[PDB]
Symmetry: C2
Subunit: 109 residues, 2 copies
């Protein structure tokens, strides 16, 4: 078991910030400080942009999968037959709401 609270704060915040209009790849690009065309410039102004460079894109993906399993995030069909987005669940919003005023743990396996 390990407390992933600090990393969960970054990722769940990124999902919130980007408005749950994209899949999890965009929050990850955001945290990894990407210059990708997929990510709008307005977001590069946010203080969290590029603050997740310590971890690889692959790591952040693996992490997002666990957070889905644990019920903090969910993926759902949106827009059309091709697309899905990644969203905070109510549980994820509750955790984030608290995390926004003091550090929260999020322990995994």
């Amino acid at each position: 078991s390990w407390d992933f609270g600090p990393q969960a704060f970054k990722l769940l915040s990124a999902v919130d910030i980007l408005g749950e209009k994209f899949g999890i790849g965009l929050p990850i690009l955001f945290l990894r400080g990407s210059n990708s065309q997929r990510l709008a410039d307005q977001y590069r102004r946010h203080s969290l942009f590029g603050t997740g460079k310590d971890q690889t894109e692959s790591w952040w993906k693996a992490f997002s999968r666990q957070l889905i399993t644990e019920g903090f995030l969910v993926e759902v069909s949106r827009y059309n037959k091709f697309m899905k987005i990644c969203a905070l669940t109510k549980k994820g919003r509750n955790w984030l709401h608290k995390a926004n005023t003091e550090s929260q743990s999020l322990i995994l396996q």
Copy 2:
């Protein structure tokens, strides 16, 4: 056993055309019809440009390995400590010289 003469003609021709100035990557980019910056535009006017499109870069690389083992191609250290080029052997050049006027077989395994 299979006769790879038609493919050998393309690859050994490509090595010669690029002047043995590179490793095997540039000959393959040439055969696969690449838009790469690495490949000068003058070569895109050659009749063999893009004629190896029906085999993957991976295949051509594997194929080049066999041709080295069978003594048609050699890798040669050149320029500086980082570099090697892929050249025709005397055998490879004799084979290509004949292949230029009538089809030659090149039987593998």
